[PDB]
Design a binder for this molecule. Structure first.
Ligand SMILES: O=P(O)(O)OC[C@H]1C[C@H](OP(=O)(O)OP(=O)(O)O)[C@H](O)[C@@H]1O
Ligand SMILES: O=P(O)(O)OC[C@H]1C[C@H](OP(=O)(O)OP(=O)(O)O)[C@H](O)[C@@H]1O
Ligand SMILES: Nc1nc2[nH]cnc2c(=O)[nH]1
Ligand SMILES: Nc1nc2[nH]cnc2c(=O)[nH]1
Ligand SMILES: [Mg+2]
Ligand SMILES: [Mg+2]
Lengths: 150, 145, 150, 145
């Protein structure tokens, strides 16, 4: 079962999150967790009017029951006065790592499953563990055959 | 409170309803309830491959009386009657009367009008206004600042 | 070669067409050519406030170099005071047939190719003959694999 | 003139056509997105090309430029992306900072078209490009009341 997320819906959720992050003066900038948090971070930057947008690149490859993660690029700092945004939190593996790198940052996401829900400071939509979130950047408008060939 | 429905999502729901109407060979045609059922009817017609698409136009006049501007012929046997949603089921009662043998379906359905439909896709609260795609558009929205 | 038409864009064109059809008081109703003109007709009906929407169902069948036309259902009258709308005109084969059924009707479409262009009373977008118009109702938002497996 | 409307779907289509030109992907070390216009396009290229190293370059006006933050290096092996190039004001500044970088944009106007290595859509000098992140689906009253 999949939870389809179109661009329009994502933008709606992002604006709802931005309204909570007001005022925008309390924020020095935004730290987007590449690559998923890039689009939501761009949207928050637009709504809050933040021009200082940085990133934290962390690749993770699962090997059976253990994860091998490495920070390809890291934003200098502790996240003091910064908003760390990611598209979603599933198991919370990434969230835990991010919180250790930027403990003084306001960690937020758009979607949050039950596992990673206690790790984020704020989120917008609740999604089940068994439900797979299909993001807009992974989809596209293409031809789809009729249910029937009548 | 409001419930926003984009074209993409409406089509996703239409395709789910279309799958439940299979096989398409059991249907003679589709009667769309103007104007709400026009788009959903067009989507079903595409998915099921039904080319016989007709319409039923109803207008409103102490009491609120119904007025049939245009009507599709028949009692609805072998036809699908489609409307975008059922709130209280006022218009739903009128359609049921005209096409008793038809398979009345909608995309959305609120608690009050839920019993009047043969099938629907999404449940919506009674107090929630469903904002359909044909009433919206992509325009400039000022930053929250 | 192809031309992609999203729901948003189709609606933009439909609203532009509705503007030229004003005032709406001069129209008795709308006759949509199923199935292509169904969505465009619905949009016009909403924009113009027309509640009288009817249809004309004509089935085609290409048998080599000749067409087999069969009218499944048709609106009454000659289209006097009515707006007959279809999504597009390619060769103009359908347009000719419809114009002969409703001679007093204002025939309009959203898209128009050079061949059928002279057959309509009004249209919105010019499309080349070699270009295939991909309508929204034939498409859908689904997963699309990355251009590379990096 | 008038306004060139760009929806999310269309922007993504242009982004994919650009991505196919930047192949192979192995020739790139990373992507430098120009804040804030190149953030979304940069995210789409990163997904299509499979590049996980994405940095940013933030510039503010006051005109003389001001670098709020800048990515490291001369941009050798990197792709610098912005959503568009109008006159090339900010483009000239990017060239100076990341000389050995491959500068690309989605849209390009006559005046700024030379200052970029590659783009996808040509837009007139007097036409205002309305980006998706500045718009939203809201209720739009019917043309006729
Ligand atoms: O909660 P976790 O189980 O730790 O995973 C959630 C992560 C991973 C996924 O990104 P990736 O799958 O890492 O890929 P991408 O870089 O494209 O975002 C998603 O966008 C979040 O950042
Ligand atoms: O200019 P022509 O070459 O005559 O074709 C243009 C017609 C045919 C096509 O519909 P169909 O292919 O007939 O199917 P549908 O009922 O789904 O619109 C399109 O929507 C126009 O109505
Ligand atoms: N797109 C996507 N990526 C993920 N990575 C981990 N969980 C998810 C999910 O639900 N969706
Ligand atoms: N979708 C679609 N249907 C057509 N039927 C004839 N020409 C066309 C076209 O270009 N697009
Ligand atoms: Mg991620
Ligand atoms: Mg047709």
């Amino acid at each position: 079962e999949k939870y389809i997320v179109t661009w329009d819906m994502l933008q709606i959720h992002a604006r709802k999150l931005a309204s909570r992050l007001m005022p925008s003066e309390q924020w020095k900038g935004i730290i987007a967790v590449s690559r998923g948090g890039l689009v939501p971070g761009a949207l928050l930057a637009r709504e809050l009017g933040i021009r200082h947008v940085d990133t934290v690149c962390i690749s993770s490859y699962d090997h059976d029951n253990q994860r091998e993660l490495k920070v390809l690029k890291r934003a200098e700092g502790d996240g003091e006065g910064f908003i760390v945004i990611d598209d979603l939190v599933d198991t919370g593996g990434t969230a835990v790592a991010i919180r250790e790198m930027y403990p003084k940052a306001h960690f937020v996401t758009i979607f949050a499953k039950p596992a990673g829900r206690p790790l984020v400071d704020d989120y917008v939509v609740d999604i089940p563990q068994d439900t797979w979130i299909e993001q807009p950047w992974d989809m596209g408008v293409v031809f789809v055959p009729p249910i029937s060939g009548r």
